[PDB]
Amino acid sequence: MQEHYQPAAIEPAAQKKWDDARISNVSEDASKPKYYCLSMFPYPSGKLHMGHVRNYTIGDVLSRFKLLNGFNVMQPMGWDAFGMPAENAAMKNNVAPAAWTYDNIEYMKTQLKSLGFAVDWEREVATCKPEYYRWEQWLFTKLFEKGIVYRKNGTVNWDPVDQTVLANEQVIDGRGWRSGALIEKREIPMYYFKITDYAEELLNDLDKLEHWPEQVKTMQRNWIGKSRGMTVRFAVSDDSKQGLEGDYAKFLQVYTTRPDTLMGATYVAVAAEHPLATAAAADKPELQAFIAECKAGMEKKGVPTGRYVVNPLNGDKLEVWIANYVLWGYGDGAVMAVPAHDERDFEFAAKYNLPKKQVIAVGDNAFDANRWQEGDKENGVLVNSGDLDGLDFQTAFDAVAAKLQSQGAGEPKTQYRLRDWGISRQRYWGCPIPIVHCEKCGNVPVPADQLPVVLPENVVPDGMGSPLAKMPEFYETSCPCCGGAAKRETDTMDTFIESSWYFFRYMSPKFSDGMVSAESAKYWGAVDQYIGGIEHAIAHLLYARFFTKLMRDEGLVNVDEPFERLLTQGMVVCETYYRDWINPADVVISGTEKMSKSKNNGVDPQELINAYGADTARLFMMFAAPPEQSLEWSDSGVEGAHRFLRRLWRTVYEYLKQGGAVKAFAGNQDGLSKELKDLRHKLHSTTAKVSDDYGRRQQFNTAIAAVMELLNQYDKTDTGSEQGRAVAQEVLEAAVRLLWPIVPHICETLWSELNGAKLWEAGWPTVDEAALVKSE
Ligand SMILES: CC(C)C[C@H](N)C(=O)OP(=O)(O)OC[C@H]1O[C@@H](n2cnc3c(N)ncnc32)[C@H](O)[C@@H]1O
Ligand SMILES: [Mg+2]
Ligand SMILES: [Zn+2]
């Protein structure tokens, strides 16, 4: 054993030892329990930096821990290669997106290999390769013929800087997710996934996820935004039906989220384009001028119609008003009004002298009918509501439902803030949409045998429009239904399509007959442990659950949920500079910020490895903070981690130098001195603590600190006697195994100096319970 700790000697040798043994190349082996640990794969939008390294080191620690515990561990890595991240970085450097992506991938592979992650590289995927994206094209066509994917014109989010439409989940505070530019509204046909068909299942199945952070589930619940409401039909008065036809001559229908206030409705509003408004305006120029002023176009305005509808629950004849705040096409185009319990209706009734019937009371408060007081749903009881008096909200809801159901005048209706997922992008670098437009047959999907629709890679966009719409050699084709002249779709799929199913592709990444093979899907099931940032809560983490249910319903998988456990690691943060983002190693001082290529404050892992070794980089990331807490970059933290590794190396070197290796102490410890019994007590207490920290608490910094304390007590114990050396051997053999998930290169090397067996076959250290009993 050499005296000096030299990471450049031992880390390549350890990595070759692990690669040769193929311990990370796993098959569907039915003898060991499976463990699927996955970190969110990166965009090839530049060099990885230490923030990514923290993400992936956390995954490796958990993978290596489960490996030593006898699991068949799949930890796969790959490249989220399509979409704006890679393309925007390529265009900034005048490089074609394809060439830029593949070169970035190869540098990112060398970075990760230098860090010694226990990755099954034989499962590597690159999402921009046709062997990958053909299968999402296949799924697209299958869902298109079912109507789960559809094309429709509509109002969309337009990003004027990235020059593409964006999904709702990609609009962050009204700004594009990559550009930061203020979003605009346009009318543009897009392709949609009917994710609202799965809104209820997406919402309810969150309750299954006992091992997700509550915050992620809460954000998804609010994004889905379910509201249980009530459809209510008001019978049109017999004297108020002139000019109307069909249902509009019979009833006026509205949707409301407060049917407990239905007994308090004092008037009703309709949109200017509602058939009741147009029928009432036919005989009166009073309303036509208001409908014209409304159809032209915020402050609330309204006019009475003289038409009346009948409240189904008490028979009150409410007057119909035309109001500029009632949007047509939004629902029924009509609403009821409860001013005493809705602030908007209170203002409308105050501005136009409309009654205010109180129907809810909160505790012991009075009702001043001319001053709005702060609409409580949770704390409230009904008054002036017939047999509804005394009922709280949820009981009044179901009671009103039963009442309306008995007369055919209404029924419960659930709505969601979630809208359908718009996936069309006016971008070159993305999965081609497998549609051909035929003048005779319409928008037709490409046959399965003709898939993939191959994206040409010989393209350098100029930044002025969709490049594919500019290439007749791409879009001119034949219709697959009739053989006439036709045009391929030239929009591509948003990059989140690829990340919504890549975790299944890892299970069988060379499978040529489908997205994922039935045998491998049945073996691996779902991801046991997922690690990635909280920024994915409303988009990827929601999209992925949706795709999983889609693929399940197509018969491709048999799980309901893609990810069992989710760890959202904290951000690595670092100082930033701008002028034009500079890097600290090389103006303005924009202050401490998340490490990101977008701010050019990333620390390259390869440079730290070249100066200090991969084990140092890994150790600092796991020791500096609990994994969910943000971690501030620090040179002294790097140096402190390196000194500990020198201490570990020096500790074993000095032990071996004074006698060499002996057999570790084991068995009954009666006869050991008290100092050595205390050391064994600390040793096995530390094994229990580390085991619990890796497994149950997932707190790796305190695991490292526990091992440091064991070494502290070791240093203060005289271990030079024969029994001392056996206990020293035991301490050091446990210590390097406990730390191997964190710093495997130095622990593998030290293990081989201590013991001739293979570390991963000696397994995880066991707790000797007899060592934990205190002496009398
Ligand atoms: C599943 C896909 C939609 C993922 C997508 N391709 C993506 O986000 O790719 P990206 O390459 O941006 O990030 C890859 C992973 O690294 C984490 N990460 C990045 N910066 C930092 C940081 N400063 N501190 C800690 N962690 C960080 C980030 O949260 C993510 O889990
Ligand atoms: Mg369960
Ligand atoms: Zn045709």
Side-chain angles (χ1 to χ4, degrees), residues 104-128 130-138:
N104 257 253
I105 286 181
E106 283 312 304
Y107 184 69
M108 283 168 45
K109 190 168 172 168
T110 63
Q111 287 180 296
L112 295 173
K113 272 174 172 295
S114 298
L115 284 155
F117 295 144
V119 165
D120 193 350
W121 286 107
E122 290 171 345
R123 287 163 190 277
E124 178 181 2
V125 314
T127 61
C128 63
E131 43 260 55
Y132 185 90
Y133 64 73
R134 70 174 298 188
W135 294 115
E136 66 193 31
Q137 290 182 339
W138 174 91

Side-chain angles (χ1 to χ4, degrees), residues 369-370 372-373 375-377 379-390 392-404 406-409:
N370 296 93
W372 168 265
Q373 307 180 75
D376 197 336
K377 303 192 3 169
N379 318 114
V381 89
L382 266 69
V383 297
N384 310 288
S385 301
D387 45 40
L388 296 165
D389 283 358
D392 46 62
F393 170 85
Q394 279 97 16
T395 60
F397 183 97
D398 291 302
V400 169
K403 294 162 80 72
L404 297 172
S406 86
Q407 39 195 138

